Amino acid sequence: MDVLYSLSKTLKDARDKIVEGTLYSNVSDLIQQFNQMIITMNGNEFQTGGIGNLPIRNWNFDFGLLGTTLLNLDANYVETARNTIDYFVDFVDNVCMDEMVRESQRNGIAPQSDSLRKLSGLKFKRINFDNSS
Amino acid sequence: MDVLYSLSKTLKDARDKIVEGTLYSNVSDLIQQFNQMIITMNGNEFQTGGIGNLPIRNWNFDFGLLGTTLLNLDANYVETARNTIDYFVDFVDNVCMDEMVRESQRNGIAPQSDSLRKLSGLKFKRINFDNSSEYIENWNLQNRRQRTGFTFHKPNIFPYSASFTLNRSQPAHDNLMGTMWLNAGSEIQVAGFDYSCAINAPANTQQFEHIVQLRRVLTTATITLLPDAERFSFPRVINSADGATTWYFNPVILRPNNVEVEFLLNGQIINTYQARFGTIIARNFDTIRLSFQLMRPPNMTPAVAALFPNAQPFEHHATVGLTLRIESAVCESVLADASETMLANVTSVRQEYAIPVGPVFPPGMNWTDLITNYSPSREDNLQRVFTVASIRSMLVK
Amino acid sequence: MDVLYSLSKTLKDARDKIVEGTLYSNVSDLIQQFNQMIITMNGNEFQTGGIGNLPIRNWNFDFGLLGTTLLNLDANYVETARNTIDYFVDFVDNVCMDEMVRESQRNGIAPQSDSLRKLSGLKFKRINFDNSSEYIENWNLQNRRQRTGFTFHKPNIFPYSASFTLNRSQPAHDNLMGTMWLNAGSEIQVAGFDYSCAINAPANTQQFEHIVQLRRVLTTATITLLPDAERFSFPRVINSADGATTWYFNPVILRPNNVEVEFLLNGQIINTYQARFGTIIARNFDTIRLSFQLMRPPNMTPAVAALFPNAQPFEHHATVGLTLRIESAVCESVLADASETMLANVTSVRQEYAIPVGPVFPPGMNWTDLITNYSPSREDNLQRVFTVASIRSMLVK
Amino acid sequence: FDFRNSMHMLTSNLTFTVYSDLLAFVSADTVEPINAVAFDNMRIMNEL
Amino acid sequence: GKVVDSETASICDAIFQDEETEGAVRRFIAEMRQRVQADRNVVNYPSILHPIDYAFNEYFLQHQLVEPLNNDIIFNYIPERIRNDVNYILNMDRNLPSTARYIRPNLLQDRLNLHDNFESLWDTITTSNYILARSVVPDLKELVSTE
Ligand SMILES: [Zn+2]
């Protein structure tokens, strides 16, 4: 669960703090966190949906990191990034929605979906952060 | 534009994180960003004003930097800084205000002022940072274009409208049937009245209906629906449709029968609720249709029977009603609501500086007029102007 | 002038052929041409405006060349370019508009503005290229004493004219004979009426004729000719020729007899068609002559006989007519038509900037007035002004 | 190995001149000792 | 065309000839020239490394710890005092090319508070700083004959 959270403030504090120009050092502490994620992911397949009118979209991972080199971000840097975020966006949506319907009388407080039951896994907790929401 | 934004979160995340004490470390990633700015600036002359009662202060730039040769910020460090910020504050104010008035039909969605037209310049883009302020977050997404969106408590979607429609009337106005309503802001109250209490109506039931077409689609709306329209539950003397005379309304209220609320989108029913009062969700709609009936009571105690005779004069007028309030909703277009100060900020700056009526906005930024004819040009200008107001409120309230 | 042209196909074939992706050598022959320009420019200062509500903007130049490298154009390359084009765009606009208003008598065909008079300069000619834009293609050929026109449509050759001519009339207007018509744009409708139904006419036939003189020759015209003038087939109350009273027209329509259309050039018949309805070709003409007759029906059923008595009152007025429409044609002179936006562009820019009436064009660029007195000066100014409008529309619509 | 993904463009400055030690460029003489003065300004060592 | 460095060079001449490498390659290698702007000091040279290599060398460029240099800065590396101590004369003589470049001295204070436990070492410092001092303290003059 807490996992899930990060995945977002990750993107927001991302799709927000990354604009044509900004001097790198406003994100050094950020870029890092980001990459860390990509790694943990790549290689693990995922499944969502499977009820009512909820499509069964499948997902895969294999993405390049993010050159932490440059001092001032050039437009070209952004686009090659936004294109990688828009897969996580369109992803998470399909993720939230999937566990935003299943219910359980007994332990109806814990995770349910084949998507999330795999997230609470241990090898993933290498991500949590900035829980101010 | 995006430029503008930074200039602020720069100062706020500045005038806030810079105080007698703290360890450098908290601002290392910050100080830097800051300086970068100063550089790009120094040397460029700026002009603001030249309209109505708006001063024309000119600004020169020649400022030092910020040593990074310290750990704990000594008071002396602050003051030598605050003095340099207070020129940017008193500046930005004079900047926002300047572009918070000019309007353009053709390209209203764009920058205008001799101040900003120079900001969108390329040599300045070297600044932009920390775009988490709900409004900018949405400004950007709108230029690449996608599912934009905002949040409003008791939004302001209904232009003020208070009227009636007599479906059955006669000169004496002694046996009317019709509806009267008040649509305003986020609320609708509508009453259906039948002076005859459906005495000659099929199944002794009179059908009523009230349709309200929103100028913009609302999504994820939390709505309160209650039976009765208190506003139309008391005696009134009203002007006739032609304004030639006045009629008397003496209501007695009955429960609305077969209540059905439909939230439609492009003619399609998206949500429908049958006699459900309390809190209901309307997830995506551009139209609300309220249908309800007055059913003559099949069984009446003497006191009730006495109010509804078989023949005129009809002295107690059977009335049924509904009240609907949109507590919160999301809209892809900016709107005024009950919590945000944007409309008030824009309207206030224009009023204070005696800004002349322009070609886009109605006189006085009148909300009813604006939302009634919410053209693309008015919306683009409104969004630009609301986004600037939000940038300004980060520093000046 | 020709200068001006390039400045555009430069940008279009630019803002179009340059995008995140394309391989290197798809722009080699292009990049070059581009730069060449920048050079010639930088250093020279420009000015636009100073007339009516036209913003007097000042322009300067000083832009770097390029990084004539990288294979598959990297995004970063684009943006650093688009930012340099958007100064030329917003420029040219302010340039076209400036010379899209000034009129000159004696020699009005040439450049006027302080902006353009400097462009025809020699040190600038180092730019012209790709003159396939129908209009420039024709501008050049014209400075070379040579023939060639433009392809038009549902053209606008006829100044508005709606009137009648009574060949036989009397105070009561109860037994008239004559014609009424509407010439407008590319269409002509004409009706011949004879209240007496040729009762006393030789061979019981009344001859009619309608002549229309074009202000410019049209060549290669595709024309639709149909019997009947629907516009003059209904009852009317019309003002008398002297404006002192009104007459009644109550038409009943008969087929036009012995229809003959002649397309003449300098008095000579170039094309002639006898009773041919549908699509006909008129290859070169400056005049159209429509001749048609009303022939009293030699045999009439009772219902028909009843409409045409031997003696007055004549209550049903025998009418025959023709409709002619020029679908397309070529003209050696610029004209307004139903597809091109030139006239509208010129008229619109002048109206928007409150440009004062000048010495050449009629108030409001009124088409009827313009084509009615289409002097050489008006045509030279119109062509200059239309060519500029077309250059502008390559970038700004 | 994919070429285009390996080929990069280079932003390098052009022709500096590095200086160390520094100071040196400081031309400086000194009054004659008999004329000293402290923050005082009246004179240090004033007992003729 | 002029290019980056040795390796960069080699590679080109090399591939240029491995027949099976898109006619586009030769092209690019071909017409692609350096970037030489005299004014400003710009030099954009065509190069080739590798993702991880560009990575390196890159930051090395974006962190050229080399600030400018004006007569003014020289004047400034000087204690606010002394300049305001008449007894001492200051003046300039050499000019400064807009080529001037130095290396920040990095003088962040104590950072480490040894002055509250590491006696052993302070003593060694003081000692040091002390001898240092004697080396400077000007010798005296004009005394009163001992005898
Ligand atoms: Zn057509």
Swiss-Prot record, chain A:
PTM section of the record: The N-terminus is blocked. Sumoylated with SUMO1 and SUMO2. Sumoylation of viral proteins seems to have a positive role on viral replication.
Region Interaction with the inner capsid protein VP2, residue ranges: 62-73
Subcellular location per the Swiss-Prot or TrEMBL entry: Virion
Bridged cysteine pairs (disulfide): none
Domain of life: Viruses
Family assignment from sequence similarity: Belongs to the rotavirus VP6 family.
UniProt miscellaneous comment: The VP6 trimer contains a zinc ion located at the center of the molecule. The zinc ion is not essential for either trimerization or transcription activity of the DLP. Zinc-depleted VP6 has an increased sensitivity to proteases.
Subunit structure: Homotrimer. Interacts with the inner capsid protein VP2. Interacts with the outer capsid glycoprotein VP7. Interacts with the outer capsid protein VP5*.
Function: Intermediate capsid protein that self assembles to form an icosahedral capsid with a T=13 symmetry, which consists of 230 trimers of VP6, with channels at each of its five-fold vertices. This capsid constitutes the middle concentric layer of the viral mature particle. The innermost VP2 capsid and the intermediate VP6 capsid remain intact following cell entry to protect the dsRNA from degradation and to prevent unfavorable antiviral responses in the host cell during all the replication cycle of the virus.
Protein name in UniProt: Intermediate capsid protein VP6
Organism the protein comes from: Rotavirus A (strain RVA/Cow/United States/NCDV-Lincoln/1969/G6P6[1]) (RV-A)
Residues included from the entire protein: 1 to 133 of 397
Curated annotation (Swiss-Prot), chains B, C:
Keyword terms, alphabetized: Calcium, Capsid protein, Intermediate capsid protein, Metal-binding, Ubl conjugation, Virion, Zinc
InterPro entries noted in UniProt: Capsid_hemagglutn, Rotavirus_A/C_VP6, Virus_capsid_a-hlx_vir
Pfam families: Rota_Capsid_VP6
Subcellular compartments: Virion
Name of the protein described by the UniProt record: Intermediate capsid protein VP6
Family according to the record: Belongs to the rotavirus VP6 family.
SUPFAM superfamilies hit by this protein: A virus capsid protein alpha-helical domain, Viral protein domain
Entry's Gene Ontology BP terms: fusion of virus membrane with host plasma membrane
Start and end residues of each stretch annotated as Interaction with the inner capsid protein VP2: 62-73
Top-level taxonomy: Viruses, Riboviria, Orthornavirae, Duplornaviricota, Resentoviricetes
Residue numbers binding Zn(2+): 153
Function statement: Intermediate capsid protein that self assembles to form an icosahedral capsid with a T=13 symmetry, which consists of 230 trimers of VP6, with channels at each of its five-fold vertices. This capsid constitutes the middle concentric layer of the viral mature particle. The innermost VP2 capsid and the intermediate VP6 capsid remain intact following cell entry to protect the dsRNA from degradation and to prevent unfavorable antiviral responses in the host cell during all the replication cycle of the virus.
UniProt keyword Ion transport, yes or no: no
Binding-site list for Ca(2+): 266, 286
PTM annotation: The N-terminus is blocked.
Other comment: The VP6 trimer contains a zinc ion located at the center of the molecule. The zinc ion is not essential for either trimerization or transcription activity of the DLP. Zinc-depleted VP6 has an increased sensitivity to proteases.
GO molecular function: host cell surface receptor binding; metal ion binding; structural molecule activity
